[PDB]
Amino acid sequence: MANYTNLTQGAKEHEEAENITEKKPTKTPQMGTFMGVYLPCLQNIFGVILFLRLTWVVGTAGVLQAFAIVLICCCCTMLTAISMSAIATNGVVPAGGSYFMISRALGPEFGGAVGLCFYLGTTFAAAMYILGAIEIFLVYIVPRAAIFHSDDALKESAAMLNNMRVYGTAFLVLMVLVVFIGVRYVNKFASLFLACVIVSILAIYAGAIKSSFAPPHFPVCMLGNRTLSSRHIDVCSKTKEINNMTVPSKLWGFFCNSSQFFNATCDEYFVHNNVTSIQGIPGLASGIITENLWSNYLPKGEIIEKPSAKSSDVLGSLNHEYVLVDITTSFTLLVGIFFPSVTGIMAGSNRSGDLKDAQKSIPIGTILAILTTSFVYLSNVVLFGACIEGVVLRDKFGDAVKGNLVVGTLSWPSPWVIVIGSFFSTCGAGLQSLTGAPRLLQAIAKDNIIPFLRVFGHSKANGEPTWALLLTAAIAELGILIASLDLVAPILSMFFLMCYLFVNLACALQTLLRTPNWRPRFRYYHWALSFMGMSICLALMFISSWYYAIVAMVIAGMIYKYIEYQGAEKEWGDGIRGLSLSAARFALLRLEEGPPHTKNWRPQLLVLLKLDEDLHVKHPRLLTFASQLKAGKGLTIVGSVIVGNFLENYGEALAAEQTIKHLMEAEKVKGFCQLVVAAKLREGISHLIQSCGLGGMKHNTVVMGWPNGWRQSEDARAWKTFIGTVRVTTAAHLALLVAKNISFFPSNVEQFSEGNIDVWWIVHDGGMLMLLPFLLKQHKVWRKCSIRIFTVAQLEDNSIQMKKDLATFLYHLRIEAEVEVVEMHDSDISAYTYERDLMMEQRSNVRRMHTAVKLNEVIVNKSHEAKLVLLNMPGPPRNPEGDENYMEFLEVLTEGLERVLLVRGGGSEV
Amino acid sequence: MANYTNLTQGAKEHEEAENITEKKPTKTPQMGTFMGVYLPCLQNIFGVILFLRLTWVVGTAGVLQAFAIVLICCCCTMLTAISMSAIATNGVVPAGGSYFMISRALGPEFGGAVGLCFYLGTTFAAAMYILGAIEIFLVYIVPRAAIFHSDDALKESAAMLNNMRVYGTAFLVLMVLVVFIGVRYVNKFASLFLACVIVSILAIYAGAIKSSFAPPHFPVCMLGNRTLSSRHIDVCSKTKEINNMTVPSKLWGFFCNSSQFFNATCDEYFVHNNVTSIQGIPGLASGIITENLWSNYLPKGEIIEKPSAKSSDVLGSLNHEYVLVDITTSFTLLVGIFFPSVTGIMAGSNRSGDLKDAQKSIPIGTILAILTTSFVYLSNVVLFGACIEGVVLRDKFGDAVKGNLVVGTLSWPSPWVIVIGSFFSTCGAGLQSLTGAPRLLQAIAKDNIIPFLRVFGHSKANGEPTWALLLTAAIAELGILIASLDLVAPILSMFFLMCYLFVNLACALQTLLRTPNWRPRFRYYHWALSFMGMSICLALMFISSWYYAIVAMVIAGMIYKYIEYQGAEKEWGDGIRGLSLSAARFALLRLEEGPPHTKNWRPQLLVLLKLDEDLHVKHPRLLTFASQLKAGKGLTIVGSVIVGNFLENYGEALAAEQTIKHLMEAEKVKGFCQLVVAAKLREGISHLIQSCGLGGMKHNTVVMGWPNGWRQSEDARAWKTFIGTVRVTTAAHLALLVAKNISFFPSNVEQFSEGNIDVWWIVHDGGMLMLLPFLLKQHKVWRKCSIRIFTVANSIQMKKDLATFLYHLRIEAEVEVVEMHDSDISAYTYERDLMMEQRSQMSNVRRMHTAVKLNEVIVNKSHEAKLVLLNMPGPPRNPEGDENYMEFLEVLTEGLERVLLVRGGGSEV
Ligand SMILES: *[C@@H]1O[C@H](CO)[C@@H](O[C@@H]2O[C@H](CO)[C@@H](O[C@@H]3O[C@H](CO)[C@@H](O)[C@H](O)[C@@H]3O)[C@H](O)[C@H]2NC(C)=O)[C@H](O)[C@H]1NC(C)=O
Ligand SMILES: *[C@@H]1O[C@H](CO)[C@@H](O[C@@H]2O[C@H](CO)[C@@H](O[C@@H]3O[C@H](CO)[C@@H](O)[C@H](O)[C@@H]3O)[C@H](O)[C@H]2NC(C)=O)[C@H](O)[C@H]1NC(C)=O
Ligand SMILES: *[C@@H]1O[C@H](CO)[C@@H](O)[C@H](O)[C@H]1NC(C)=O
Ligand SMILES: *[C@H]1O[C@H](CO)[C@@H](O)[C@H](O)[C@H]1NC(C)=O
């Protein structure tokens, strides 16, 4: 015993859930995976197409191509089921319909795009289902009751379309009234609709089985290889004997105008060929599948010909009774006509609020439902191929079989069971989609995702959409005006295909780009699956119509970008400003949930500009050299401290910030400026070094200017601060670039004709040292200079192996660089070796000076005339007392060189 | 006297310019706008189509639809010229070709995508032009020298393709050798090629004019309304009299097998109808335009029928001599066949290094060249409509006119001048595109934009592409293997259409989004024009082929994203990490060059978390309330100061940072964390308030916790620091949110059944105060509460504005104005007066005794509220009355459950 439904859950349920945040009523609607996602999805996938058009598709395509069609459609819907299950498992499943899940999983932009595309899909589905119910009623149930009787022969089709337009509009107004007043009854009879569907399918299978030994007696009159209609004929014989008199049969009256055979003038094909009674349903074992295993694709108005019977060759006798191909078929048309029979998988999660284990019921339920329907379709394709005559299949309105439903002829009790079950199922699906479309529309309106749809957010006392339904009815009316399933199906299929394409593309993107909160806890979801689904039914979209598909893509893209713009204006306050703001925030967030390190190290600079008492940059050269080092790309944060109290220096801070920005723009520096008004310059710099940049966009190198004239100034703060900053940089594990004699650094406009960047590679931190000159040489200023590595390791035997390691590394760099190893006494490099030993264990002053002068001797003797001498640095002393000695060591170590870039790694650089 | 060229300038010139950075040689190549951009673009737009296929297109389309085709193509190329001129004016024009301009203007990603699409365009153009030169030579000049003689009927049709494939491959190997050895000669003879083109067009016009009084004698044999070929027939008469004997003419031998008229068995149409000589070029005044003003679109193999002359009705006599439609035409096919006649506008700026005023010569020159060629095409459409028979036009191989070029029949001297000028022009354009494709390829390789193309960066001693040219030759070979202009034209057109679509879309985007360094100094460029061009010829792309267009779009998109990825990995060091890094940096940069303010104010929070001596968050409720306030969207920077020395507390700073990040994620706060290890807590907070966030992603509100138990603690620093922070926030012009009794603030899981957020709106700063409760109510926790505004006081004007804002907000709120004595609100009115005074230029016992009145009213009205917002008075000017200020605040909030003290201190709207 159970009282379930197959409809959706709109804003009413999501709202109840949110309020219920802070139960016995909830527990009772809890439904297992089977009755929660299997039956809703099964009742909503099994549409009208399976009946009114599957036999026709099989016939006009040949079992092979029909199998290919059903397989491609089922493949796009199965990969979309996998992507939708990945969405369902990821995070908490909201209580609303599939729209709320898709929204909370893919962001409001994709949520709204999918919502509107799926909504247009559902409206045109309510239109197709009303057209189908009308077509079944009118062609098969009550043919006599058509308001416009067919006029002559040429206007017979036109008279039918008007019957369908008027009857469909009346029926649509009826269905709208039903859904508006008494949707509870629709919920109650969803089970009866599913019952009708399943009874119909079991009747189809029972007929197919019975058709092996005893097939039914539905014969078709056929003149040679020309199939005849049986809507008016009684006997498939040229002369029907009446009262022992061989009077001509009615077909004679339809091919010869005499009607009395008194010297009757019969046309050519009638006199030459012969009328035969061909069994319309041969046995399943008869082996007709070999006959109908091939496409027909006859264009419009072509006579349907069974390529088995004999025939004469005369032509010209065009007649009304010849059953004709009613539409110029093709593969790309058949795929579109059949696709709305696999749609409805988003209905699997239309009952997600009343579930027990959502992430477990929704994926399994949906995939099992799609497997069931795919098996039913792929089995019925072959059964129709192997049970129905190759002529009764191409009959798209049950003609030539005495006016019975083509699939109806395959049934155990009678074709009547199917002709009524299809009608009830199709009107039920129309009601279902006229309840599912306006609920989704009011949910998209209530979310305030799109502003102008706010009007449709209005609900009834119970939370039913009063003003969304009217728009749904209007769109269904526009659809019904094209009173033909064969022409509504491509549009419906295109809208549902766009919905499925976005559901597959959002999952592929969010898996590749490592989108935050994208944890697809599924045992079989791989982004390649969703990508293959997106590709497959993108191809499907374009195949069916290349112009409708572009219109759908552009509509969805405009809705997506407009939702993004509205979200920007909502959260940041401005449209385009806020749009870039959201882009930056999202990039930084995505940047946070990732490995902290990088496979390669690239210097992101923090230029520490020193501001004089006039609040002017004391060293613009710093900015010029930073621009040359980064070459206008990358991150450059220009930081500076203004000594004083912030409470009264805000105006000065703003003025100096404008000054530094103008200077950066003048020196082609692309980056950002940050001023800190601090009580102590040293503490301000210690705060800039560790706090600049938003998380994930941190710097990793600190670029400083050398404290020129440290000895001259009586105050010891200037030299002591530089050391403090060096210690802060080393402790923070950031790289350090101390530029000395920066006033002589070349400007952005001038250039070097010829020169040598003499990188000095000393025991360690070789990665930063080697990487620097190439970044410099990549700029036009340092472009025309060479590079010389004066390695100072051991003597020569060690160097040969190292020479190979450096030469190959440089080979990977692919920039010319000659390395020379100069033997140096360990004592001369004692301070370095000491620091290295301290590092290895972790993982005097007179000697330092007397060795620094040896370093001076070698460095000047080799590199006196260099344009820029890079040089590795030793760490600062542990005791802050020897800071003067450390600065003297550095000053002597750099005595006599034109332009030095002291470099200290102090990090895991490679 | 001048020696100019129409070829491109690749990496060799761009490199010379860059080196020449730090002249007499440069000055000499300087060329004026006319000879620098008008003639190169004119010489490169006038291709082979104008001759070999324009007459055929006019005929098979009808003058009206042919006019529509030429107009649509010219419209896409003109809008693309406007966008490309906008690119040319914006910024300095690089010395290289058009590729370098497009690159430096649209970024390397679009630069490389457009470069490769335009490169495939140029290669398939070298293929089409070689095919055209071969077709002209073989069909019109020397038919005798064809290696595969046509045989039978079906074999004869495919006999030609083998002649064309072999001759085209031979010609392509010849052209490749020429360009490889002696491109200087091509530069020298570019002028002769342009001369041939212009002489040919003037010959067309002279023929059209002469066709007014005296049209030429090109007759066509026509059997009834069935056109015959005249390659073998001599007289358009059934019987050709020989030696005074009426012997049957050869056409009799081609329709009757007797050949002696001895009881000859002639077929049906031949016996019934008549052969007639129809003047093939009637006068311009003859008025045939009225006849050929309509489309034909006859499918493949259909006999071409003039619907004017008499005819019998018998059918069945299918014959070889009946001129047949050689391809199943359609409108969408004609647009594709014709589009490669308007391509070449990027060649206008292929000589930009040798210019005087680039930003002035390139736009005018390009637009004038396109106007000239568009007028020439639209004029020749009408001239062909009004001068050539409606049957001679649909002849795509000069049949029925004795085997002469269709357009050749319209010329003053003879069709030979055009048939040779077209051949030389088409081989010259082939040479041009076999020099322009590899130069562009080596420029894309040398830019190191795409890695794997590095092999093709290799150049010759003079800087000629040795290995790029070979790939161009291979692709041209693959093109020539499809030995038919009618099938190469759609591919060429698709590649050039993709190039133009990207050039229009990048400009539209960079104009809309306010991309940095996008200054389009043009007098007529509006982004709507580039957008209309993008749309027009996107439609053109898809019309011509919906599957080729998708393949091109996917190829270009993959190249674009791959270039972006390679640039990320190059500059940042990682692929996806660096990709997000570049996205963030670019967004922030774009965010910088814009108005600092915003039309709406939205609170971007900086939560100041206080870290205790255990390095644990002393107030997680701060984060919970920040999450509720921002609702998971927006910017939230959580800042905290660790008192101590940074040299030894780095590990502690990292540990506490991980702690704060875990807490943020636990409280559903989406944002970033920044720790500052400072010697003094007050200075650390004063530095966080002014330095957090990258430029453009700044905060505008500071969210603080109230210093609970300030009086109890003997140390006065705790209460004094809060005031210091308030002053820092006010001075920085940021909003301020002081939360009091924050330990009682509701958690993210619980909710309120019913309650009232009692926003108290006092004289000023009404914008922040009104905006807050609605952002709070937008969260599920505060969803089920009501709002009550207890207004106490241009305050009257402000109240009306607030009411209007409430109406705009559309969320139910009831406002009550309570009369209060000015003395009670004295501290507020005093501050307001100070504000008005400063704006115009551009005690304690009373404050406490009035604060208690404020307490009386506020508690009597709002004692049971769930959250009482309340405006704040400014801190005293003298830092001595700071205790008095804190006492004022403490009493002002005495008795309320949960208070959010709010201070605007900014231009909040
Ligand atoms: C159903 O019967 C009609 C009536 O004869 C068939 O029409 C004709 O069928 C032939 C196939 O034999 C078609 O092709 C012809 O083939 C012969 C083979 O030598 C060839 O000599 C002819 O020139 C022609 O190509 C023919 O086009 C078709 N129509 C006419 C007017 O003759 C029809 O094909 C039969 N159904 C099927 C499925 O074959
Ligand atoms: C060139 O001359 C031939 C020889 O008659 C034309 O063939 C026939 O042309 C007629 C049009 O005059 C076509 O349509 C017919 O129209 C009459 C009008 O009443 C109608 O009674 C017929 O049933 C038919 O629809 C006809 O299809 C066509 N072919 C045959 C076999 O008659 C040919 O059309 C002429 N060329 C042009 C461009 O018109
Ligand atoms: C063919 O020529 C004869 C005599 O010149 C003429 O009478 C007849 O009408 C012509 N046929 C047609 C179709 O004009
Ligand atoms: C059709 O079948 C009949 C048997 O009544 C036969 O006489 C007639 O010849 C058949 N058609 C043929 C062979 O033309």
Author numbering:
A (entry chain B): 102 to 123, 126 to 946, 1028 to 1094
B (entry chain A): 102 to 123, 126 to 896, 901 to 949, 1028 to 1094
Give the text the authors published on this PDB structure.
They are characteristically inhibited under isotonic conditions via phospho‐regulatory sites located within the cytoplasmic termini. Decreased inhibitory phosphorylation in response to hypotonic cell swelling stimulates transport activity, and dysfunction of this regulatory process has been associated with various human diseases. Here, we present cryo‐EM structures of human KCC3b and KCC1, revealing structural determinants for phospho‐regulation in both N‐ and C‐termini.
To understand the structural basis of phospho‐regulation in potassium‐coupled chloride transporters, we used single‐particle cryo‐electron microscopy to study the full‐length wild‐type KCC3b transporter and mutants of this transporter in which two canonical threonines (T940 and T997) and a third KCC3‐specific phosphorylation site (S45), which was shown to play a role for full activation in response to swelling (Melo et␣al, 2013), were replaced. A unique feature observed in the phospho‐mimetic KCC3b‐PM structure is the presence of pronounced density for a short stretch of the otherwise unstructured N‐terminus, a domain that has not been resolved in any of the previously published CCC structures. By contrast, no densities for ATP or ADP are visible in the map of KCC3b‐PM, which could be the result of small sequence differences in KCC3b.
